[PDB]
Write an enzyme that holds these catalytic residues in place. Structure first.
Site, PDB file in Angstrom:
ATOM      1  N   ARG A  46       0.857  -1.160   0.000  1.00  0.00           N
ATOM      2  CA  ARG A  46       0.000   0.000   0.000  1.00  0.00           C
ATOM      3  C   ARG A  46       0.899   1.218   0.000  1.00  0.00           C
ATOM      4  NH1 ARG A  46      -3.128   0.019   5.266  1.00  0.00           N
ATOM      5  NH2 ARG A  46      -0.901  -0.097   5.810  1.00  0.00           N
ATOM      6  N   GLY A  47       0.739   2.057  -1.014  1.00  0.00           N
ATOM      7  CA  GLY A  47       1.524   3.266  -1.124  1.00  0.00           C
ATOM      8  C   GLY A  47       0.631   4.474  -0.968  1.00  0.00           C
ATOM      9  N   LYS A  48       1.227   5.652  -1.080  1.00  0.00           N
ATOM     10  CA  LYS A  48       0.481   6.898  -0.993  1.00  0.00           C
ATOM     11  C   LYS A  48      -0.252   7.170  -2.300  1.00  0.00           C
ATOM     12  CE  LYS A  48       4.816   9.409  -1.902  1.00  0.00           C
ATOM     13  NZ  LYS A  48       5.542   8.217  -2.421  1.00  0.00           N
ATOM     14  N   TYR A  49       0.251   6.592  -3.386  1.00  0.00           N
ATOM     15  CA  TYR A  49      -0.319   6.854  -4.693  1.00  0.00           C
ATOM     16  C   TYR A  49      -0.990   5.635  -5.301  1.00  0.00           C
ATOM     17  CZ  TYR A  49       1.665  11.520  -4.871  1.00  0.00           C
ATOM     18  OH  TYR A  49       1.958  12.843  -4.628  1.00  0.00           O
ATOM     19  N   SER A  50      -0.825   4.473  -4.676  1.00  0.00           N
ATOM     20  CA  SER A  50      -1.454   3.265  -5.202  1.00  0.00           C
ATOM     21  C   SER A  50      -1.550   2.116  -4.203  1.00  0.00           C
ATOM     22  CB  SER A  50      -0.692   2.781  -6.435  1.00  0.00           C
ATOM     23  OG  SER A  50       0.539   2.179  -6.061  1.00  0.00           O
ATOM     24  N   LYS A  67      -1.291  -2.537 -10.199  1.00  0.00           N
ATOM     25  CA  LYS A  67      -1.150  -1.326  -9.411  1.00  0.00           C
ATOM     26  C   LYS A  67      -2.390  -0.458  -9.610  1.00  0.00           C
ATOM     27  CE  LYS A  67       2.078   2.049 -10.295  1.00  0.00           C
ATOM     28  NZ  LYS A  67       3.381   2.798 -10.196  1.00  0.00           N
ATOM     29  N   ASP A 155      13.691   7.964  -8.954  1.00  0.00           N
ATOM     30  CA  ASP A 155      13.365   7.285  -7.700  1.00  0.00           C
ATOM     31  C   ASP A 155      14.144   5.964  -7.597  1.00  0.00           C
ATOM     32  OD1 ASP A 155      12.127   6.976  -5.191  1.00  0.00           O
ATOM     33  OD2 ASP A 155      10.212   6.306  -6.032  1.00  0.00           O
TER      34      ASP A 155
HETATM   35  O1  LIG Z   1       5.204   1.402 -10.654  1.00  0.00           O
HETATM   36  C1  LIG Z   1       5.319   0.241 -10.289  1.00  0.00           C
HETATM   37  C2  LIG Z   1       5.084  -0.110  -8.986  1.00  0.00           C
HETATM   38  C3  LIG Z   1       5.211  -1.487  -8.578  1.00  0.00           C
HETATM   39  C4  LIG Z   1       4.969  -1.896  -7.213  1.00  0.00           C
HETATM   40  C5  LIG Z   1       5.589  -3.225  -7.106  1.00  0.00           C
HETATM   41  O2  LIG Z   1       6.854  -3.074  -6.508  1.00  0.00           O
HETATM   42  C6  LIG Z   1       4.899  -4.390  -6.261  1.00  0.00           C
HETATM   43  O3  LIG Z   1       5.419  -5.619  -6.487  1.00  0.00           O
HETATM   44  C7  LIG Z   1       5.805  -5.983  -7.932  1.00  0.00           C
HETATM   45  C8  LIG Z   1       5.882  -4.977  -8.978  1.00  0.00           C
HETATM   46  C9  LIG Z   1       6.219  -5.286 -10.308  1.00  0.00           C
HETATM   47  C10 LIG Z   1       6.512  -6.629 -10.633  1.00  0.00           C
HETATM   48  C11 LIG Z   1       6.447  -7.621  -9.590  1.00  0.00           C
HETATM   49  O4  LIG Z   1       6.723  -8.959  -9.873  1.00  0.00           O
HETATM   50  C12 LIG Z   1       6.095  -7.295  -8.263  1.00  0.00           C
HETATM   51  O5  LIG Z   1       6.036  -8.299  -7.278  1.00  0.00           O
HETATM   52  C13 LIG Z   1       5.575  -3.655  -8.570  1.00  0.00           C
HETATM   53  C14 LIG Z   1       5.558  -2.357  -9.474  1.00  0.00           C
HETATM   54  C15 LIG Z   1       5.806  -2.016 -10.833  1.00  0.00           C
HETATM   55  C16 LIG Z   1       5.690  -0.690 -11.196  1.00  0.00           C
HETATM   56  O6  LIG Z   1       5.926  -0.294 -12.520  1.00  0.00           O
END
Ligand SMILES: O=C1C=C2C[C@@]3(O)COc4c(ccc(O)c4O)C3=C2C=C1O
Length: 334
Positions: A46-50, A67, A155
């Site tokens: 759980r994030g601030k934006y998603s 997401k 980031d």
């Molecule tokens: O902007 C984002 C944000 C996330 C959140 C997050 O970190 C959660 O967990 C993930 C994942 C992507 C692949 C994956 O396999 C996994 O477990 C995620 C992302 C990809 C993005 O482009």
């Protein structure tokens, strides 16, 4: 007169020379997939934006990650989508599979390839010297690619680098703060996690560029080879620069400030004080020395520089002797 202006050393005009539709995300029109293709299975974070969920594509039984975005202006959502689409297929860039409208929240939900990533606990207590070099090299491929495509990630941090260790597979994720580089543009300095913010952000120098990502990456390298996460641990943005100065020294910091004619609050100077530049060897002890080499320290020193213009580019970094063994290994006949 104000601060001295700055331009990126490399990839300066990549967007200048592309069609407007490449970087003008505000005009991008989203074509929506079908949310009923995906069933949520468990919440990951759980994030601030998603909100982030593990999900199943019920039409082929493949795992995906979804997401679901918080309500935000269309422009910021379009920016992330445009950037993910521009970068799709790039080396070690997370793959955006679909964009759907979540039927409950009525907000956009982004669908990504699933990466079975190794948890931090196990990873950063099992990583060898060679592992670190290999994964650093893989991160550099992604950063060189996205920089060459005119995009700053802004980031870069451990939690935005997914690693499936048994398959030696890495993805750079979380492109929600990413932005197109245009020479001369003054950017928002409220980007990156505190611990990975470059000096340029901490002194409110807005005309930064791709080199911000290289500072963040240097912070990651230090944390890995010295086994201290985060390496620079400030309690706020002011104290963050103090933690950097206690290592890099104040001499080179004030030289940086002088070169770009940056003005600091007088109280900033106070907390900054006067600190000698420490030798990198000061942070080597018995529990991390197997991760440290002369090549690693030389490489580290060329990333963690105050002056953004003097840091290695991603492509230069990949040519460093630190990576000779990795490069050899990747040169395969196939
Ligand atoms: O902007 C984002 C944000 C996330 C959140 C997050 O970190 C959660 O967990 C993930 C994942 C992507 C692949 C994956 O396999 C996994 O477990 C995620 C992302 C990809 C993005 O482009």
């Amino acid at each position: 007169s104000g601060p001295v202006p700055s331009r990126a050393r490399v990839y300066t005009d990549v967007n200048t020379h592309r069609p407007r539709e490449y970087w003008d995300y505000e005009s991008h029109v989203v074509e929506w997939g079908n949310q009923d293709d995906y069933q949520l299975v468990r919440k990951l974070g759980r994030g601030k934006y998603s909100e982030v969920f593990e999900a199943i594509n019920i039409t082929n039984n493949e795992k995906v990650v979804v997401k679901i975005l918080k309500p935000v202006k269309k422009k910021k959502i379009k920016r992330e989508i445009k950037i993910l689409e521009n970068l799709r297929g790039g080396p070690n860039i997370i793959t955006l599979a679909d964009i759907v409208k979540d039927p409950v929240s009525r907000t956009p939900a982004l669908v990504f390839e699933h990466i079975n990533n190794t948890d931090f606990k196990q990873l950063y207590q099992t990583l060898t010297d060679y592992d670190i070099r290999f994964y650093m090299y893989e991160i550099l491929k992604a950063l060189d690619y996205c920089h060459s495509m005119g995009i700053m990630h802004r980031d870069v941090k451990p939690h935005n680098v997914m690693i499936d260790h048994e398959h030696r597979k890495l993805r750079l994720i979380d492109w929600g703060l990413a932005e197109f580089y245009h020479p001369g543009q003054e950017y928002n300095v409220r980007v990156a996690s505190r611990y990975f913010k470059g000096p340029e952000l901490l002194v409110d120098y807005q005309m930064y560029d791709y080199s911000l990502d290289m500072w963040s990456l240097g912070c990651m390298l230090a944390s890995m080879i010295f086994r201290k996460e985060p390496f620079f641990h400030g309690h706020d943005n002011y104290d963050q620069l103090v933690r950097i100065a206690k290592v890099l020294g104040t001499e080179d910091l004030y030289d940086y400030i002088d070169k770009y004619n940056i003005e600091l609050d007088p109280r900033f100077n106070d907390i900054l004080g006067r600190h000698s530049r420490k030798r990198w060897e000061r942070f080597v002890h018995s529990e991390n020395q197997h991760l440290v080499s002369p090549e690693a320290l030389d490489f580290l020193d060329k990333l963690l520089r105050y002056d953004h213009q003097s840091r290695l580019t991603a492509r230069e970094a990949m040519e460093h002797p630190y990576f000779y063994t990795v490069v050899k290994d990747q040169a395969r006949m196939g």
